Amino acid sequence: DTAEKGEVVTKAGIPIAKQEMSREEKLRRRRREKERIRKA
């Protein structure tokens, strides 16, 4: 809620941008968010 527009923040509290993030890490972050959504 207090991050920048282009960037995301991880669970570690570190800003990483969606542009510099690769395709494999994008897929893995989508899978982890979908795993949390399935848990809830």
Binding site: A12, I14, I16, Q19, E20, M21
Partner: protein
């Protein structure tokens, strides 16, 4: 879409004032007060004022003060600061006082910059210092409405006032005694004085001046009297024998020898003393725009001023000419697609066809059409081929240049031709659109209906109907059904123009979109209250929007330019992202860190910083291990320092 440029009101209703520097000019629009240079025409400044309409303003011969008084009883003085460049000025307030119990209607400022006199509606008339708020002496008290004043000296100063009845009274400021002259029958409009001749001229509404048709402004130069009244003509008279040699106001510069005419068409005419240029004050309510020439340098606008004005688009404010053939109100307007023929429909029952001669000052109305008994509402054009005229009544007509029919029940609205001239459709208030054969008297069919009442049709070089509800439809020739329907407006639409589509509203917004998609592309929000008509540049995509408000806004397309900018931006982005990956792979941590701070994405910047603080072979004097990274951290800019700090708090959160 960006605003290419606007044309704006300069004058509406109130009093105009000229400084002895004939560059600057202060005029009124509504409640506001706007001052502009005359020669370059750009907007110097605009003071807002209070909510009530402004009554009277003046500027001193030295353009140092601007004194405004509204219809609410108030008076504000503004000091002005002019640079060597006359392009822009800043007005700042000095004094706000309430002069009398009634709002003042007349003001007069002396040739020197030290006294201004003001005259009210009850008759209480006073004199004030301009540099500081005084009443240096009150002169009459409230008797009858003061309609004129004049400051003069005899070669200490004296001031003359002319009342609402014919009473001219002169007093010395030092003697402080008023003496009338004989007194006069009706409303004296203005008083002027010649110091070369020791002579007072009084011009009045009973068509007389004392040492016609009407009188509004008289004055000297110079030995040549002048007069302006309801006749519309300025007349020049000799001083010594009475043989010679509407208008709301006229002032006398003559050291610069220009006389300004404030015509009650709300126009400003510059006359030379032995039509230099004219500037239209307000295009009051614009009924139709049509963008005319072969090269399209000169748009013809049409409004309530009982005539048409041709003003240039390629100084940008100068009107080339004025063309008057109609009698009542010019209502609609249409040009041939092959150049030189413009045609005008009117509240007068006559319609007409004018030539446009571009490389001359010649403009003629040489084709006229009697037609039917009601107002010719709209004109359409396929020497031109012929003319199709519509009507306030149901009588639609078609006539050739060197036939009638019944179409609808109510007043019809708009008319448009195809570029090949085989089809023709008409639109009206009884929710029908009618296409018919244009050569014979035959009918090709009928559009089924647009819910309330259809306002504008358009042909695609596919027919477009804009209606009285908040919808707009696209119909065909083949089935006579709507192909497309669109919503999204908040009032009437009143004009649909083809691109190279766009639609104005009556909800002051003009919006563009495309037909095969069918969803809204962009919306445009410049204007004041209303919007009426749209013209288009025929070569490129430039939209000219005008309405009941007097401003006309010119928009140009920028989509190709911003697409080229986004394309080259993505080119530069992929190039510098690859050189960042190259510097990371090569181990050039310095230029890698510079390029990462430029590319603003930090997940790689953190890895570069962990590497440079653990390089395993650090320089002993260096702060972060590398002298080059020390150099860039020393030579960082302010925005890069602040963005680095905004990343440093996020890296400082993590204990790793």
């Amino acid at each position: 879409f960006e605003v290419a440029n606007v044309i704006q009101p300069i004058y509406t209703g109130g009093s105009v004032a000229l400084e002895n520097g004939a560059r600057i000019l202060a005029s009124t629009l509504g409640e506001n007060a706007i001052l502009t240079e005359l020669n370059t025409g750009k907007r110097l400044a605009e003071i807002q004022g209070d909510g009530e309409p402004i009554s009277t303003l003046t500027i001193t011969p030295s353009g140092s003060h601007l004194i405004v008084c509204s219809r609410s009883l108030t008076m504000r003085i503004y000091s002005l600061a002019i640079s060597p460049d006359y392009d822009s000025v800043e007005p700042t307030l000095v004094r706000t006082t309430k002069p009398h119990a009634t709002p003042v209607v007349v003001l007069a400022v002396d040739r020197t910059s030290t006294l201004l006199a003001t005259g009210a509606a009850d008759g209480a008339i006073k004199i004030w210092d301009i540099i500081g708020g005084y009443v240096t002496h009150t002169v009459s008290g409230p008797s009858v409405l003061v309609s004129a004043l004049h400051f003069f000296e005899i070669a200490r100063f004296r001031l003359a006032w002319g009342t609402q009845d014919g009473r001219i009274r002169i007093f010395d400021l030092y003697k402080r005694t008023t003496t009338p002259v004989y007194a006069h029958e009706s409303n004296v409009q203005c008083i002027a004085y010649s110091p070369e001749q020791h002579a007072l001229l009084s011009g009045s509404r009973d068509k007389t001046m004392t040492l016609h048709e009407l009188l509004e402004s008289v004055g000297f130069l110079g030995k040549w009297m002048y007069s302006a009244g309801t006749s519309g003509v300025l007349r020049i008279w000799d001083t010594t024998t009475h043989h010679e040699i509407a208008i709301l106001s006229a002032v006398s510069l003559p050291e610069r020898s220009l006389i300004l005419c404030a015509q009650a068409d709300f126009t400003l005419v510059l006359y030379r003393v032995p039509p230099f240029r004219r500037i239209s004050g307000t295009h009051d309510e614009i009924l139709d725009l049509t963008y005319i020439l072969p090269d399209q340098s000169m748009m013809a606008i049409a409004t309530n001023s009982e005539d048409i004005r041709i003003v240039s688009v390629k100084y940008f404010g100068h009107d080339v000419a004025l063309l008057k053939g109609h009698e009542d109100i010019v209502m609609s307007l249409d040009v041939d697609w092959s150049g030189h023929w413009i045609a005008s429909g009117s509240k007068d029952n006559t319609a007409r066809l004018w030539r446009v001669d571009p490389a001359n000052n010649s403009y003629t109305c040489y084709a006229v059409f009697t037609g039917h008994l009601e107002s010719v509402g709209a004109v359409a054009l396929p020497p031109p081929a012929f003319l199709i005229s519509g009507s306030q009544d149901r009588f639609v007509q078609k006539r050739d240049i060197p036939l009638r029919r019944l179409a609808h029940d109510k007043d019809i609205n708009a008319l448009d031709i195809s570029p090949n001239g085989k089809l023709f459709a008409s639109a009206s208030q009884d929710k029908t659109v009618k296409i018919w054969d244009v050569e014979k008297l035959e009918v090709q069919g009928i559009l089924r209906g647009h819910k309330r009442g259809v306002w504008t049709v358009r042909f695609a070089p596919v027919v477009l109907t804009g209606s009285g509800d908040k919808t707009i439809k696209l119909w065909n020739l083949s089935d006579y059904t709507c192909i497309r329907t669109f919503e999204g407006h908040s009032h009437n639409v009143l004009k649909v123009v083809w691109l190279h589509f766009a639609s104005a509203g009556a909800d002051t917004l003009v919006k563009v979109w495309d037909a095969n998609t069918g969803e809204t592309e962009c919306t445009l929000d410049n204007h004041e209250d209303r919007l009426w008509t749209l013209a288009v540049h025929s070569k490129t995509n430039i939209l000219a929007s005008a309405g009941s408000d007097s401003k006309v806004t010119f928009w140009r397309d920028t989509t190709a330019e911003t697409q080229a900018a986004a394309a080259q931006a993505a080119l530069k982005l992929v190039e510098q992202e690859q050189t960042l990956e190259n510097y990371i792979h090569a181990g050039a941590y310095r230029d890698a860190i510079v390029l990462a701070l430029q590319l603003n994405h930090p997940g790689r910047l953190l890895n570069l910083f962990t590497n440079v603080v653990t390089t395993r072979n650090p320089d002993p004097d260096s702060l972060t291990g590398l002298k080059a990274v020390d150099d860039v951290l020393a030579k960082l800019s302010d925005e890069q320092i602040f963005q680095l700090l905004l990343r440093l708090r996020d890296w400082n959160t993590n204990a790793r």
